[PDB]
Protein backbone atom coordinates (compact mmCIF):
# COMPACT_ATOMS: atom_id res chain seq x y z
CA UNK A 1 0.00 0.00 0.00
CA UNK A 2 1.45 3.36 -1.03
CA UNK A 3 0.03 4.92 2.14
CA UNK A 4 2.38 2.78 4.23
CA UNK A 5 5.46 4.40 2.70
CA UNK A 6 3.70 7.77 2.66
CA UNK A 7 3.50 7.44 6.46
CA UNK A 8 7.22 8.26 6.49
CA UNK A 9 6.29 11.93 5.93
CA UNK A 10 3.19 12.31 8.11
CA UNK A 11 5.58 13.72 10.74
CA UNK A 12 9.07 15.20 10.53
CA UNK A 13 12.34 13.55 11.47
CA UNK A 14 13.16 13.16 15.13
CA UNK A 15 9.60 11.91 15.74
CA UNK A 16 8.18 8.40 15.37
CA UNK A 17 11.62 6.82 15.09
CA UNK A 18 10.56 3.16 15.21
CA UNK A 19 7.86 3.71 12.57
CA UNK A 20 10.18 5.32 10.03
CA UNK A 21 12.90 2.86 11.01
CA UNK A 22 11.14 -0.35 10.09
CA UNK A 23 9.45 1.35 7.14
CA UNK A 24 12.91 1.94 5.69
CA UNK A 25 13.80 -1.61 6.70
CA UNK A 26 10.85 -2.94 4.70
CA UNK A 27 11.94 -0.81 1.74
CA UNK A 28 15.45 -2.21 1.86
CA UNK A 29 14.01 -5.70 2.13
CA UNK A 30 11.92 -5.21 -0.99
CA UNK A 31 14.90 -3.93 -2.98
CA UNK A 32 16.95 -6.86 -1.71
CA UNK A 33 14.30 -9.34 -2.81
CA UNK A 34 14.42 -7.81 -6.29
CA UNK A 35 18.19 -8.04 -6.43
CA UNK A 36 17.99 -11.60 -5.15
CA UNK A 37 15.48 -12.70 -7.77
CA UNK A 38 17.81 -11.29 -10.40
CA UNK A 39 20.93 -12.91 -8.92
CA UNK A 40 19.10 -16.23 -8.62
CA UNK A 41 17.67 -16.20 -12.14
CA UNK A 42 20.93 -14.99 -13.69
CA UNK A 43 24.07 -16.66 -12.37
CA UNK A 44 22.03 -19.27 -10.49
CA UNK A 45 23.25 -21.33 -7.59
CA UNK A 46 24.50 -24.89 -7.73
CA UNK A 47 21.60 -25.90 -5.45
CA UNK A 48 18.25 -24.58 -4.26
CA UNK A 49 19.59 -24.41 -0.71
CA UNK A 50 22.38 -22.05 -1.72
CA UNK A 51 19.85 -20.05 -3.76
CA UNK A 52 17.75 -19.62 -0.62
CA UNK A 53 20.90 -18.61 1.27
CA UNK A 54 21.64 -16.00 -1.40
CA UNK A 55 18.14 -14.58 -1.01
CA UNK A 56 18.43 -14.51 2.76
CA UNK A 57 21.82 -12.82 2.78
CA UNK A 58 20.78 -10.15 0.28
CA UNK A 59 17.44 -9.45 1.95
CA UNK A 60 18.73 -9.30 5.52
CA UNK A 61 21.62 -7.12 4.38
CA UNK A 62 19.41 -4.55 2.68
CA UNK A 63 17.02 -4.69 5.64
CA UNK A 64 19.88 -3.87 8.01
CA UNK A 65 20.87 -1.04 5.67
CA UNK A 66 17.42 0.51 5.82
CA UNK A 67 17.16 -0.02 9.57
CA UNK A 68 20.44 1.70 10.36
CA UNK A 69 19.46 4.47 7.93
CA UNK A 70 16.15 5.18 9.63
CA UNK A 71 17.61 4.93 13.13
CA UNK A 72 20.44 7.31 12.33
CA UNK A 73 18.20 9.82 10.54
CA UNK A 74 15.56 10.07 13.24
CA UNK A 75 18.19 10.06 16.00
CA UNK A 76 20.36 12.79 14.48
CA UNK A 77 17.15 14.75 13.85
CA UNK A 78 15.97 14.32 17.45
CA UNK A 79 19.42 15.22 18.68
CA UNK A 80 20.50 18.58 17.18
CA UNK A 81 16.90 19.48 16.52
CA UNK A 82 16.89 20.16 12.79
CA UNK A 83 14.46 18.20 10.58
CA UNK A 84 15.12 20.36 7.50
CA UNK A 85 18.79 19.40 7.40
CA UNK A 86 20.16 16.90 4.84
CA UNK A 87 23.22 16.24 7.00
CA UNK A 88 21.05 13.83 8.99
CA UNK A 89 20.35 11.90 5.80
CA UNK A 90 24.05 12.05 4.99
CA UNK A 91 24.95 10.50 8.34
CA UNK A 92 22.27 7.87 7.80
CA UNK A 93 23.62 7.02 4.37
CA UNK A 94 27.09 6.70 5.84
CA UNK A 95 25.78 4.37 8.53
CA UNK A 96 24.19 2.33 5.76
CA UNK A 97 27.45 2.19 3.85
CA UNK A 98 29.22 1.12 7.04
CA UNK A 99 26.76 -1.72 7.53
CA UNK A 100 27.24 -2.66 3.87
CA UNK A 101 30.99 -2.86 4.37
CA UNK A 102 30.50 -4.75 7.64
CA UNK A 103 28.07 -7.40 6.38
CA UNK A 104 30.36 -7.57 3.33
CA UNK A 105 33.90 -7.71 4.64
CA UNK A 106 35.41 -4.62 3.01
CA UNK A 107 36.61 -1.22 4.19
CA UNK A 108 36.72 0.15 0.66
CA UNK A 109 33.13 -0.86 0.07
CA UNK A 110 32.33 0.83 3.37
CA UNK A 111 33.87 4.15 2.35
CA UNK A 112 32.57 4.08 -1.23
CA UNK A 113 29.06 3.25 -0.07
CA UNK A 114 29.21 5.84 2.70
CA UNK A 115 30.00 8.66 0.29
CA UNK A 116 27.59 7.54 -2.42
CA UNK A 117 24.60 6.68 -0.21
CA UNK A 118 25.12 9.75 1.96
CA UNK A 119 25.09 12.08 -1.03
CA UNK A 120 22.10 10.21 -2.46
CA UNK A 121 20.09 10.57 0.74
CA UNK A 122 21.07 14.23 1.08
CA UNK A 123 19.81 14.85 -2.44
CA UNK A 124 16.68 12.88 -1.61
CA UNK A 125 15.89 15.16 1.31
CA UNK A 126 16.76 18.27 -0.70
CA UNK A 127 14.37 17.19 -3.44
CA UNK A 128 11.60 16.19 -1.07
CA UNK A 129 12.05 19.64 0.47
CA UNK A 130 12.34 21.78 -2.69
CA UNK A 131 9.94 19.74 -4.82
CA UNK A 132 11.87 17.70 -7.36
CA UNK A 133 9.27 15.55 -9.13
CA UNK A 134 11.14 12.69 -10.72
CA UNK A 135 9.03 10.78 -13.21
CA UNK A 136 7.01 13.96 -13.84
CA UNK A 137 3.93 14.20 -15.96
CA UNK A 138 4.44 16.05 -19.27
CA UNK A 139 3.70 19.77 -19.04
CA UNK A 140 6.07 21.71 -21.23
Amino acid sequence: VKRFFESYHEVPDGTQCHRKTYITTALGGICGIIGSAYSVSLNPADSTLEAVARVGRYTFTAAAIGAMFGLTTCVSAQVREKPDDPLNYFIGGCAGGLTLGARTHSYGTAAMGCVYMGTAAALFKIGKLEGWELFPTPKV
Binding site: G127, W132, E133, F135, P136, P138, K139, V140
Partner: protein, 344 residues
Amino acid sequence: MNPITLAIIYFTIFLGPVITMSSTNLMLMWVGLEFSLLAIIPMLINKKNPRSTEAATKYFVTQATASMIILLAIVLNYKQLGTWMFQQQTNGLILNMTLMALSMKLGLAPFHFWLPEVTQGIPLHMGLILLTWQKIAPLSILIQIYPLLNSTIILMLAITSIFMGAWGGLNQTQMRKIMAYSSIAHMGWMLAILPYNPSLTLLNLMIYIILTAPMFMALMLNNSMTINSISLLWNKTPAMLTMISLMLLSLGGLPPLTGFLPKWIIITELMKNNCLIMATLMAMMALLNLFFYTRLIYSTSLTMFPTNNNSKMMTHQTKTKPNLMFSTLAIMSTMTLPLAPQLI
Protein backbone atom coordinates in the same frame (compact mmCIF):
# COMPACT_ATOMS: atom_id res chain seq x y z
CA MET B 1 20.40 -17.32 -52.40
CA ASN B 2 18.90 -17.11 -55.87
CA PRO B 3 17.53 -13.71 -56.94
CA ILE B 4 13.81 -14.47 -56.71
CA THR B 5 14.27 -15.33 -53.06
CA LEU B 6 16.25 -12.19 -52.30
CA ALA B 7 13.60 -10.07 -54.00
CA ILE B 8 10.86 -11.71 -51.94
CA ILE B 9 12.73 -11.47 -48.64
CA TYR B 10 13.92 -7.89 -49.00
CA PHE B 11 10.48 -6.79 -50.19
CA THR B 12 9.03 -8.39 -47.07
CA ILE B 13 11.60 -6.68 -44.84
CA PHE B 14 10.81 -3.34 -46.44
CA LEU B 15 7.05 -3.89 -46.24
CA GLY B 16 6.86 -4.91 -42.61
CA PRO B 17 7.57 -1.44 -41.26
CA VAL B 18 5.88 0.26 -44.21
CA ILE B 19 2.67 -1.58 -43.37
CA THR B 20 3.29 -0.61 -39.75
CA MET B 21 3.37 3.12 -40.57
CA SER B 22 0.55 3.35 -43.12
CA SER B 23 -1.97 1.49 -41.00
CA THR B 24 -4.54 2.71 -38.50
CA ASN B 25 -5.54 -0.81 -37.48
CA LEU B 26 -3.23 -2.07 -34.77
CA MET B 27 -3.68 -5.56 -36.21
CA LEU B 28 -2.11 -4.73 -39.56
CA MET B 29 0.53 -3.04 -37.44
CA TRP B 30 1.14 -6.41 -35.79
CA VAL B 31 1.18 -7.99 -39.26
CA GLY B 32 3.98 -5.67 -40.32
CA LEU B 33 5.99 -6.52 -37.23
CA GLU B 34 5.56 -10.19 -38.03
CA PHE B 35 6.75 -9.71 -41.60
CA SER B 36 9.86 -8.06 -40.18
CA LEU B 37 10.21 -11.08 -37.89
CA LEU B 38 9.66 -13.83 -40.48
CA ALA B 39 11.81 -12.35 -43.23
CA ILE B 40 14.84 -11.63 -41.05
CA ILE B 41 15.50 -15.23 -39.98
CA PRO B 42 16.61 -16.60 -43.40
CA MET B 43 19.41 -14.08 -43.70
CA LEU B 44 20.35 -14.44 -40.05
CA ILE B 45 20.67 -18.19 -40.59
CA ASN B 46 22.26 -17.94 -44.04
CA LYS B 47 25.83 -18.97 -43.20
CA LYS B 48 24.52 -22.11 -41.43
CA ASN B 49 26.63 -22.45 -38.31
CA PRO B 50 25.68 -23.10 -34.66
CA ARG B 51 26.19 -19.44 -33.82
CA SER B 52 23.72 -18.43 -36.51
CA THR B 53 21.19 -21.07 -35.47
CA GLU B 54 21.41 -19.88 -31.86
CA ALA B 55 21.07 -16.23 -32.86
CA ALA B 56 18.04 -16.95 -35.01
CA THR B 57 16.36 -19.09 -32.34
CA LYS B 58 16.92 -16.46 -29.66
CA TYR B 59 15.60 -13.71 -31.93
CA PHE B 60 12.54 -15.71 -32.96
CA VAL B 61 11.65 -16.92 -29.49
CA THR B 62 12.07 -13.50 -27.91
CA GLN B 63 10.07 -11.70 -30.59
CA ALA B 64 7.19 -14.18 -30.74
CA THR B 65 6.32 -13.60 -27.08
CA ALA B 66 6.42 -9.84 -27.52
CA SER B 67 4.17 -10.20 -30.56
CA MET B 68 1.66 -12.27 -28.60
CA ILE B 69 1.68 -9.69 -25.80
CA ILE B 70 1.00 -6.87 -28.25
CA LEU B 71 -1.85 -8.89 -29.73
CA LEU B 72 -3.23 -9.37 -26.22
CA ALA B 73 -3.13 -5.62 -25.65
CA ILE B 74 -4.93 -5.08 -28.95
CA VAL B 75 -7.62 -7.66 -28.22
CA LEU B 76 -8.19 -6.26 -24.74
CA ASN B 77 -8.63 -2.80 -26.27
CA TYR B 78 -11.10 -4.27 -28.77
CA LYS B 79 -13.07 -5.86 -25.93
CA GLN B 80 -13.02 -2.65 -23.91
CA LEU B 81 -13.92 -0.11 -26.60
CA GLY B 82 -14.90 -2.00 -29.74
CA THR B 83 -12.17 -0.43 -31.84
CA TRP B 84 -8.73 -1.23 -33.23
CA MET B 85 -6.89 1.81 -31.90
CA PHE B 86 -5.46 2.77 -28.53
CA GLN B 87 -7.64 5.72 -27.65
CA GLN B 88 -7.44 7.71 -24.49
CA GLN B 89 -9.53 6.19 -21.66
CA THR B 90 -7.85 2.84 -22.22
CA ASN B 91 -6.38 0.79 -19.39
CA GLY B 92 -2.88 1.64 -18.26
CA LEU B 93 -2.19 -2.06 -17.87
CA ILE B 94 -2.92 -2.63 -21.56
CA LEU B 95 -0.73 0.31 -22.51
CA ASN B 96 2.09 -0.74 -20.20
CA MET B 97 2.04 -4.32 -21.49
CA THR B 98 2.29 -2.91 -25.00
CA LEU B 99 5.25 -0.82 -23.86
CA MET B 100 6.94 -3.83 -22.25
CA ALA B 101 6.58 -5.96 -25.36
CA LEU B 102 7.78 -3.14 -27.59
CA SER B 103 10.83 -2.75 -25.35
CA MET B 104 11.48 -6.48 -25.69
CA LYS B 105 11.25 -6.00 -29.47
CA LEU B 106 13.63 -3.04 -29.57
CA GLY B 107 16.15 -4.52 -27.14
CA LEU B 108 15.90 -2.17 -24.20
CA ALA B 109 17.11 -3.10 -20.77
CA PRO B 110 16.10 -5.17 -18.78
CA PHE B 111 15.03 -6.90 -22.02
CA HIS B 112 18.46 -6.40 -23.56
CA PHE B 113 20.11 -9.76 -22.90
CA TRP B 114 19.42 -11.11 -26.40
CA LEU B 115 20.58 -8.26 -28.63
CA PRO B 116 24.39 -8.49 -28.20
CA GLU B 117 24.26 -12.29 -28.42
CA VAL B 118 22.17 -12.30 -31.59
CA THR B 119 24.30 -9.54 -33.08
CA GLN B 120 27.52 -11.47 -32.46
CA GLY B 121 25.93 -14.53 -34.03
CA ILE B 122 25.36 -12.89 -37.42
CA PRO B 123 27.42 -11.04 -40.04
CA LEU B 124 28.01 -7.29 -40.13
CA HIS B 125 25.09 -6.94 -42.47
CA MET B 126 22.05 -8.31 -40.64
CA GLY B 127 23.52 -6.40 -37.72
CA LEU B 128 23.01 -3.17 -39.61
CA ILE B 129 19.43 -4.02 -40.58
CA LEU B 130 18.70 -5.52 -37.18
CA LEU B 131 19.93 -2.42 -35.35
CA THR B 132 18.60 0.26 -37.72
CA TRP B 133 15.59 -0.83 -39.77
CA GLN B 134 13.95 -3.23 -37.33
CA LYS B 135 13.88 -0.44 -34.72
CA ILE B 136 11.71 1.86 -36.84
CA ALA B 137 8.26 0.25 -36.73
CA PRO B 138 8.36 -0.69 -33.02
CA LEU B 139 9.27 2.93 -32.40
CA SER B 140 6.43 4.00 -34.69
CA ILE B 141 3.97 2.28 -32.37
CA LEU B 142 5.12 4.33 -29.39
CA ILE B 143 5.30 7.53 -31.43
CA GLN B 144 1.67 7.07 -32.45
CA ILE B 145 0.55 6.68 -28.81
CA TYR B 146 2.92 9.01 -26.98
CA PRO B 147 0.30 10.91 -24.88
CA LEU B 148 -1.00 7.63 -23.42
CA LEU B 149 2.18 6.17 -21.95
CA ASN B 150 3.02 6.28 -18.27
CA SER B 151 5.95 8.65 -17.79
CA THR B 152 7.55 6.46 -15.09
CA ILE B 153 8.47 3.07 -16.51
CA ILE B 154 9.22 4.88 -19.78
CA LEU B 155 12.07 6.55 -17.86
CA MET B 156 13.10 3.65 -15.64
CA LEU B 157 13.60 1.52 -18.74
CA ALA B 158 15.56 4.31 -20.40
CA ILE B 159 17.79 4.71 -17.36
CA THR B 160 18.38 0.97 -17.14
CA SER B 161 19.22 0.87 -20.85
CA ILE B 162 21.69 3.74 -20.43
CA PHE B 163 23.44 2.22 -17.43
CA MET B 164 23.54 -1.34 -18.73
CA GLY B 165 24.64 -0.41 -22.23
CA ALA B 166 27.47 1.69 -20.84
CA TRP B 167 28.59 -1.00 -18.41
CA GLY B 168 28.31 -3.78 -20.98
CA GLY B 169 30.24 -1.95 -23.66
CA LEU B 170 32.90 -1.07 -21.10
CA ASN B 171 34.34 -4.59 -21.30
CA GLN B 172 33.44 -5.94 -24.75
CA THR B 173 36.42 -6.69 -26.98
CA GLN B 174 34.01 -7.79 -29.69
CA MET B 175 32.76 -4.96 -31.86
CA ARG B 176 29.46 -6.59 -32.81
CA LYS B 177 28.49 -6.34 -29.13
CA ILE B 178 29.74 -2.78 -28.76
CA MET B 179 27.31 -1.79 -31.50
CA ALA B 180 24.53 -3.63 -29.68
CA TYR B 181 25.11 -1.91 -26.36
CA SER B 182 25.31 1.39 -28.24
CA SER B 183 21.90 0.58 -29.69
CA ILE B 184 20.60 -0.10 -26.19
CA ALA B 185 21.88 3.22 -24.86
CA HIS B 186 20.54 5.25 -27.79
CA MET B 187 17.13 3.60 -27.62
CA GLY B 188 17.21 4.59 -23.97
CA TRP B 189 17.80 8.23 -24.88
CA MET B 190 14.96 7.98 -27.40
CA LEU B 191 12.43 6.32 -25.13
CA ALA B 192 13.16 8.76 -22.32
CA ILE B 193 11.93 11.70 -24.39
CA LEU B 194 9.24 9.86 -26.40
CA PRO B 195 6.39 11.24 -24.22
CA TYR B 196 8.02 14.68 -24.61
CA ASN B 197 8.20 15.95 -28.20
CA PRO B 198 8.67 12.66 -30.09
CA SER B 199 10.23 14.54 -33.00
CA LEU B 200 13.46 14.35 -31.00
CA THR B 201 13.13 10.58 -30.78
CA LEU B 202 13.15 10.43 -34.56
CA LEU B 203 16.06 12.88 -34.59
CA ASN B 204 18.14 10.62 -32.36
CA LEU B 205 17.05 7.66 -34.47
CA MET B 206 18.23 9.25 -37.72
CA ILE B 207 21.49 10.41 -36.14
CA TYR B 208 22.08 6.94 -34.71
CA ILE B 209 21.42 5.24 -38.05
CA ILE B 210 23.65 7.68 -39.93
CA LEU B 211 26.43 6.93 -37.44
CA THR B 212 26.05 3.15 -37.24
CA ALA B 213 25.64 2.31 -40.93
CA PRO B 214 29.06 3.69 -41.99
CA MET B 215 30.64 2.17 -38.90
CA PHE B 216 29.30 -1.21 -39.96
CA MET B 217 30.70 -0.53 -43.44
CA ALA B 218 34.09 0.21 -41.87
CA LEU B 219 33.95 -3.15 -40.11
CA MET B 220 32.84 -4.74 -43.38
CA LEU B 221 35.74 -3.41 -45.43
CA ASN B 222 38.15 -5.86 -43.77
CA ASN B 223 35.61 -8.01 -41.88
CA SER B 224 36.80 -6.54 -38.61
CA MET B 225 35.00 -7.98 -35.60
CA THR B 226 37.49 -7.40 -32.78
CA ILE B 227 39.67 -4.65 -31.33
CA ASN B 228 42.73 -6.49 -32.60
CA SER B 229 41.30 -6.73 -36.12
CA ILE B 230 40.27 -3.07 -36.29
CA SER B 231 43.72 -2.23 -34.92
CA LEU B 232 45.31 -3.61 -38.11
CA LEU B 233 43.85 -0.73 -40.07
CA TRP B 234 46.82 1.65 -40.14
CA ASN B 235 48.24 -0.85 -42.67
CA LYS B 236 45.30 -2.19 -44.65
CA THR B 237 43.09 0.86 -45.28
CA PRO B 238 44.53 3.77 -43.28
CA ALA B 239 42.49 6.50 -44.99
CA MET B 240 39.49 5.58 -42.81
CA LEU B 241 40.86 6.37 -39.34
CA THR B 242 39.81 10.03 -39.53
CA MET B 243 36.17 9.18 -40.20
CA ILE B 244 36.15 6.27 -37.74
CA SER B 245 37.48 8.58 -35.03
CA LEU B 246 35.03 11.38 -35.66
CA MET B 247 32.15 8.91 -35.90
CA LEU B 248 33.01 7.23 -32.61
CA LEU B 249 33.35 10.63 -30.96
CA SER B 250 29.96 11.58 -32.38
CA LEU B 251 28.42 8.34 -31.09
CA GLY B 252 29.80 9.08 -27.67
CA GLY B 253 28.37 12.53 -27.80
CA LEU B 254 31.00 15.26 -27.86
CA PRO B 255 29.94 18.84 -28.69
CA PRO B 256 31.55 19.87 -32.00
CA LEU B 257 30.10 16.73 -33.64
CA THR B 258 26.40 16.42 -34.37
CA GLY B 259 26.00 13.39 -32.13
CA PHE B 260 25.80 15.76 -29.15
CA LEU B 261 22.73 17.53 -30.52
CA PRO B 262 20.24 14.75 -29.60
CA LYS B 263 21.48 14.48 -26.03
CA TRP B 264 21.66 18.25 -25.63
CA ILE B 265 18.17 18.95 -26.96
CA ILE B 266 16.78 15.95 -25.07
CA ILE B 267 18.18 17.38 -21.84
CA THR B 268 16.64 20.70 -22.85
CA GLU B 269 13.12 19.35 -23.33
CA LEU B 270 13.49 17.25 -20.16
CA MET B 271 14.52 20.23 -18.05
CA LYS B 272 11.54 22.05 -19.55
CA ASN B 273 9.38 19.52 -17.64
CA ASN B 274 11.34 19.31 -14.35
CA CYS B 275 12.90 15.94 -15.22
CA LEU B 276 16.23 17.10 -13.87
CA ILE B 277 18.07 14.41 -11.92
CA MET B 278 17.16 11.69 -14.42
CA ALA B 279 18.75 13.75 -17.18
CA THR B 280 21.75 14.30 -14.92
CA LEU B 281 22.24 10.55 -14.44
CA MET B 282 21.83 9.94 -18.17
CA ALA B 283 24.31 12.66 -19.13
CA MET B 284 26.81 11.33 -16.59
CA MET B 285 26.65 7.73 -17.87
CA ALA B 286 26.95 8.83 -21.49
CA LEU B 287 30.55 9.57 -20.46
CA LEU B 288 31.11 5.91 -19.76
CA ASN B 289 29.51 5.25 -23.13
CA LEU B 290 32.25 7.50 -24.52
CA PHE B 291 35.09 5.82 -22.63
CA PHE B 292 35.19 2.57 -24.57
CA TYR B 293 34.89 4.43 -27.87
CA THR B 294 37.95 6.38 -26.76
CA ARG B 295 39.76 3.15 -25.86
CA LEU B 296 38.89 1.76 -29.28
CA ILE B 297 40.08 4.80 -31.16
CA TYR B 298 43.29 4.82 -29.18
CA SER B 299 43.74 1.22 -30.25
CA THR B 300 43.15 1.88 -33.95
CA SER B 301 44.10 5.53 -34.70
CA LEU B 302 46.51 6.94 -32.08
CA THR B 303 48.74 4.08 -30.83
CA MET B 304 49.21 1.87 -33.92
CA PHE B 305 49.37 -1.79 -32.92
CA PRO B 306 51.69 -4.49 -34.21
CA THR B 307 50.84 -5.92 -37.61
CA ASN B 308 51.71 -9.12 -39.46
CA ASN B 309 53.95 -10.18 -42.31
CA ASN B 310 51.03 -11.34 -44.47
CA SER B 311 49.32 -7.94 -44.41
CA LYS B 312 51.59 -6.73 -47.23
CA MET B 313 49.66 -8.83 -49.73
CA MET B 314 46.66 -6.66 -48.93
CA THR B 315 48.82 -3.68 -49.84
CA HIS B 316 49.75 -5.27 -53.16
CA GLN B 317 46.13 -5.75 -54.20
CA THR B 318 43.42 -3.12 -54.63
CA LYS B 319 39.92 -2.51 -53.28
CA THR B 320 36.46 -1.48 -54.43
CA LYS B 321 34.24 -1.82 -51.36
CA PRO B 322 33.47 1.75 -50.15
CA ASN B 323 30.01 2.27 -51.63
CA LEU B 324 30.32 6.10 -51.95
CA MET B 325 27.61 6.45 -49.27
CA PHE B 326 30.05 5.84 -46.41
CA SER B 327 31.56 9.22 -47.27
CA THR B 328 28.26 11.09 -47.38
CA LEU B 329 26.90 9.52 -44.20
CA ALA B 330 30.16 9.95 -42.29
CA ILE B 331 30.51 13.59 -43.33
CA MET B 332 26.84 14.42 -42.66
CA SER B 333 27.50 13.03 -39.26
CA THR B 334 30.40 14.65 -37.41
CA MET B 335 30.03 17.98 -39.27
CA THR B 336 26.33 19.02 -39.23
CA LEU B 337 25.94 20.68 -35.83
CA PRO B 338 25.84 24.27 -37.22
CA LEU B 339 22.80 23.14 -39.24
CA ALA B 340 21.06 21.85 -36.08
CA PRO B 341 18.22 24.43 -36.09
CA GLN B 342 17.20 22.96 -39.43
CA LEU B 343 17.16 19.51 -37.76
CA ILE B 344 15.56 19.96 -34.28
